[PDB]
Amino acid sequence: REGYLEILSRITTEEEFFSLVLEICGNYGFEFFSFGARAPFPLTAPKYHFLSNYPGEWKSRYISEDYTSIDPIVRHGLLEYTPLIWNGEDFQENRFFWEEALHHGIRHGWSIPVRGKYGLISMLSLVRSSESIAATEILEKESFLLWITSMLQATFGDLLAPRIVPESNVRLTARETEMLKWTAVGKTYGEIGLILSIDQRTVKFHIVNAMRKLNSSNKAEATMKAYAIGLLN
Amino acid sequence: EREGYLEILSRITTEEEFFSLVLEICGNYGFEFFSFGARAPFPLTAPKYHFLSNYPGEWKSRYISEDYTSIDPIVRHGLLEYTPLIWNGEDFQENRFFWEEALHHGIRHGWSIPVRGKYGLISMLSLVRSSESIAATEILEKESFLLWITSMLQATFGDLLAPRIVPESNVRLTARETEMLKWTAVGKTYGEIGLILSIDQRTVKFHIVNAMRKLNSSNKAEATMKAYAIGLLN
Ligand SMILES: CCCCCCCCCCCC(=O)N[C@H]1CCOC1=O
Numbered sequence: 135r136e137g138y139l140e141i142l143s144r145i146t147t148e149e150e151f152f153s154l155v156l157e158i159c160g161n162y163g164f165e166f167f168s169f170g171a172r173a174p175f176p177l178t179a180p181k182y183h184f185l186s187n188y189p190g191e192w193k194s195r196y197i198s199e200d201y202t203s204i205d206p207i208v209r210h211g212l213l214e215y216t217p218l219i220w221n222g223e224d225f226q227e228n229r230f231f232w233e234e235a236l237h238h239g240i241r242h243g244w245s246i247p248v249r250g251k252y253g254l255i256s257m258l259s260l261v262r263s264s265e266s267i268a269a270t271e272i273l274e275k276e277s278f279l280l281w282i283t284s285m286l287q288a289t290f291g292d293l294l295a296p297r298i299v300p301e302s303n304v305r306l307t308a309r310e311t312e313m314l315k316w317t318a319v320g321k322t323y324g325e326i327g328l329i330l331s332i333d334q335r336t337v338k339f340h341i342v343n344a345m346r347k348l349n350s351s352n353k354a355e356a357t358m359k360a361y362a363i364g365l366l367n
Numbered sequence: 368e369r370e371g372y373l374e375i376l377s378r379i380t381t382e383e384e385f386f387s388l389v390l391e392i393c394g395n396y397g398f399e400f401f402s403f404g405a406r407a408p409f410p411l412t413a414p415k416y417h418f419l420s421n422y423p424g425e426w427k428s429r430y431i432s433e434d435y436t437s438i439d440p441i442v443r444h445g446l447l448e449y450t451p452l453i454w455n456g457e458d459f460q461e462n463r464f465f466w467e468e469a470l471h472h473g474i475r476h477g478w479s480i481p482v483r484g485k486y487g488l489i490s491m492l493s494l495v496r497s498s499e500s501i502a503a504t505e506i507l508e509k510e511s512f513l514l515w516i517t518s519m520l521q522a523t524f525g526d527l528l529a530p531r532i533v534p535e536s537n538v539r540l541t542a543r544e545t546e547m548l549k550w551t552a553v554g555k556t557y558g559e560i561g562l563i564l565s566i567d568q569r570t571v572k573f574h575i576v577n578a579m580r581k582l583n584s585s586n587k588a589e590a591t592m593k594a595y596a597i598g599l600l601n
């Protein structure tokens with residue numbers, strides 16, 4: 135783990151970030167990497183920011199085809215919170231996606247999902263075109279890959295969050311925080327005032343402050359953001 | 368060593384199995400006490416904790432009767448920070464009465480790993496002893512395994528206790544149900560959702576009412592928050 139904390143603090147661009155993960159990739163016996171985060175909202179159109187060194191033709195195909203929508207590594211890494219070893223030849227769904235992925239050497243993968251601050255979900259994926267991932271290779275590397283990815287997640291977070299989730303800077307008062315907690319379970323302004331023995335006018339006022347902080351147009355949208363960011367906790 | 372464990376874990380089916388397996392890691396890594404637990408994501412307003420420990424029973428009842436999950440800074444660290452915490456009770460100047468009582472029971476030198484898991488669960492392993500501070504060489508010696516085993520314990524603990532502490536986690540939602548809840552998550556009205564999908568208000572409302580039941584919620588906001596927190600909207 136030595137030196138990595140030092141390099142992750144001197145990183146200021148994605149090009150420096152890209153270079154770090156590339157060396158982690160090579161120093162650990164793999165051909166390709168991808169690293170990215172899903173921004174937690176808007177929920178209707180979820181936006182991914184990732185880097186990779188895959189063949190450039192695969193990168194354009196992957197982007198044009200919107201292959202995050204179908205990629206089982208992405209679709210499963212959103213619901214499983216633990217590392218996953220994969221082999222592209224094992225998948226019988228999306229066989230077209232996997233055929234041209236295998237065509238590019240994207241065959242034996244190791245994917246490490248982490249949840250981080252601000253509702254970011256990040257994944258490190260290390261891939262190579264040949265040589266199965268040993269069971270002995272797992273124990274030798276699993277602890278460091280797990281550890282480095284939770285460091286990368288933080289740096290990739292610190293780097294991109296103020297743009298890829300702007301509301302990451304929002305801080306709510308205690309009063310604001312409670313208004314949104316009750317608005318989360320669907321309470322009206324009046325029900326909250328009753329519960330907390332304050333006026334409906336005051337309840338509005340606090341929710342309206344928090345909506346604006348959260349660049350939201352109604353309180354149901356603001357509420358879902360505050361939860362997703364971790365502001366309700 | 369960790370290979371023995373993935374087998375022991377792939378076969379656990381009871382909380383007493385879990386309890387004794389975590390009691391064994393505590394002793395084999397030099398600690399007097401342990402706690403492992405998870406925070407259910409619902410209800411947001413008063414979310415429930417389910418944990419195990421071997422603390423003095425005088426401390427277990429006291430932690431519950433006083434509702435200490437709400438001021439315990441070790442818990443509060445795990446919810447807000449995604450990093451592990453090495454702690455020494457006597458260092459804390461806030462919530463003094465809490466720490467006097469806990470230091471009275473020898474819950475003094477601790478190491479707490481928080482991990483996020485399925486269904487919006489948040490879990491934490493803590494190991495404690497009454498003496499010998501946790502020094503930076505001991506950290507390096509045992510850090511890798513502790514973070515590793517915590518991610519393993521939470522999977523198994525979530526497997527075990529999810530049906531009870533978040534019973535909505537088994538809910539499956541229709542394609543249509545999923546997307547009426549995604550549009551409700553930004554506060555669109557039934558009519559607004561209708562015009563977006565070019566369907567009738569009442570068919571929007573039917574999907575929402577059916578998801579509300581499945582999610583055991585009494586309004587579409589509560590159900591959307593539950594669906595979101597569990598992972599059904601992704
Ligand atoms: C699940 C956690 C969310 C993190 C988002 C990261 C975005 C990463 C996109 C690329 C992932 C990735 O490398 N997919 C592989 C599968 C076969 O060919 C590929 O290209």
Ligand SMILES: CCCCCCCCCCCC(=O)N[C@H]1CCOC1=O
Pocket residue numbers: 401402403404405406416417418430436439441442443445446469474481482489490491493
């Ligand atoms: C990640 C946050 C939620 C996880 C829920 C875990 C519940 C465990 C509660 C007990 C934690 C715990 O052991 N706290 C120590 C610190 C002072 O004396 C104590 O009792």
